[PDB]
């Protein structure tokens, strides 16, 4: 009866907290957290955290107002400390770091991260340490500090060597390595391998992450100029399943690339504004991707000529000529093209490769 009426109670609380979340009543849920506190002392420290963690998770998926969200976390952490529930305090603090990150509150996502690690490093069961090291790698990268983001991730993967992780943890580790080889625009080749490991690892487990990895595999393939490969990849038995607007964007960019068409690439950037320009990681490579498209299109226009009017190239790509001259002279300077320019009577000469 008493091993029983407490179990029905745990259900009760979660279920009502669940109901508050659905009809979006943040105030009452903040109250539910405050009110359940006495109760928590009648169950194991371990079952306790489970409950408290579960509820704050409910609060943070509510659009409750960042400040109110952050408050509620500092409140529960405060309470956890003034109650000596260390494991839970720590795991609450980890959830707060996550919140700061998703909020763009990055200097504090570092400050708390800095604290919690000192603690976590001096202990066993490094599962949480991983969470936090990867979270650091994420936040350092969000702040543009590549070395210290690479540095944090190397730790994480080293920690994850002794343990055997859940696929979703593994997955995130491969997504990060993926992101970070790509970030300096320097190793799209191995960046791709991580994204493929990530994809292989997220597939049938977490399929938003799964889609994201695939998408990024495609990005890299494009970025390598290997956008022919893109079809065969999507084609394969497992990828098809993942059809959507994200995949259509990549296929559509891949296509502009194969066709060497800037006009198509402009078209695809604006039809797929959401899937591309608004994707933090894609958006990172759009700048230099834009260059390749311009160059490729220029090469395509130039290709039949051994000597061509700059005005002709300019009408053909539809850009002001002052600009178009400037670009071609840069390609010549940078050994990106084998020709020379008659600034005088407006002509570009092309040499036998
Ligand atoms: Gd494998
Ligand atoms: Gd190939
Ligand atoms: Gd539209
Ligand atoms: Gd004359």
Swiss-Prot record:
GO terms for cellular component: cytosol; nucleoplasm; proteasome complex; proteasome regulatory particle; proteasome regulatory particle, lid subcomplex. Disruption phenotype: Embryos develop and hatch normally but fail to outlive early larval stages. During the first and second instar larval stages larvae become immobile and sluggish and die without any observable defects. Lethality is probably the result of additive defects in overall cell proliferation rather than of distinct developmental disorders. Keywords: Phosphoprotein, Proteasome. Residues 187-353 form the PCI domain. GO terms for biological process: proteasome-mediated ubiquitin-dependent protein catabolic process; ubiquitin-dependent protein catabolic process. Component of the lid subcomplex of the 26S proteasome, a multiprotein complex involved in the ATP-dependent degradation of ubiquitinated proteins. In the complex, RPN6 is required for proteasome assembly. May act as linker between 19S regulatory subunit and the 20S proteasome core. Belongs to the proteasome subunit S9 family. This is 26S proteasome non-ATPase regulatory subunit 11. It comes from Drosophila melanogaster. The gene is Rpn6. The chain holds residues 38 to 390 of 422 of the full protein.
């Amino acid at each position: 009866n008493d091993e029983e009426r407490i179990r029905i109670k745990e259900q009760g609380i979660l279920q009502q907290g669940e109901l508050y979340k659905q009809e979006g009543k943040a105030k009452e849920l903040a109250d539910l957290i405050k009110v359940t506190r006495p109760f928590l002392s009648s169950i194991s420290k371990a079952k306790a955290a489970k409950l408290v963690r579960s509820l704050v998770d409910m609060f943070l998926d509510m659009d409750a107002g960042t400040g109110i969200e952050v408050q509620l976390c500092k409140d529960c952490i405060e309470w956890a400390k003034q109650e000596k529930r260390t494991f839970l305090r720590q795991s609450l603090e980890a959830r707060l770091i996550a919140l700061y990150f998703d909020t763009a509150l990055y200097t504090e996502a570092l400050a708390l991260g800095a604290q919690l690690l000192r603690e976590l490093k001096k202990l066993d069961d490094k599962n949480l340490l991983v969470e936090v090291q990867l979270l650091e790698s994420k936040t350092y990268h969000a702040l543009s500090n590549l070395p210290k983001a690479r540095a944090a991730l190397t730790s994480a993967r080293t920690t994850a060597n002794a343990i055997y992780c859940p696929p979703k943890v593994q997955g995130a580790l491969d997504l990060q390595s993926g992101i970070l080889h790509a970030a300096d625009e320097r190793d799209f080749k191995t960046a791709f391998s991580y994204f493929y490991e990530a994809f292989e690892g997220f597939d049938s487990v977490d399929s938003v992450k799964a889609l994201t990895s695939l998408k990024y595999m495609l990005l890299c393939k494009i970025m390598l100029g290997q956008s022919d490969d893109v079809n065969q990849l999507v084609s394969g038995k497992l990828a098809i399943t993942y059809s959507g607007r994200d995949i259509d964007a990549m296929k559509s960019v891949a296509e502009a690339s194969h066709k060497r068409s800037l006009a198509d690439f402009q078209a695809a950037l604006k039809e797929y504004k959401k899937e591309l320009a608004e994707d933090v990681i894609v958006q990172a490579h759009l700048g230099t991707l834009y260059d390749t498209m311009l160059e490729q299109n220029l090469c395509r226009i130039i290709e039949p000529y051994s000597r061509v009017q700059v005005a002709h190239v300019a009408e053909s790509i539809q850009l002001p000529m002052p600009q178009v001259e400037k670009k071609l002279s840069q390609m010549i300077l940078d050994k990106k093209f084998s020709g020379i320019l008659d600034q005088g009577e407006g002509v570009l000469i092309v040499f036998e490769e």
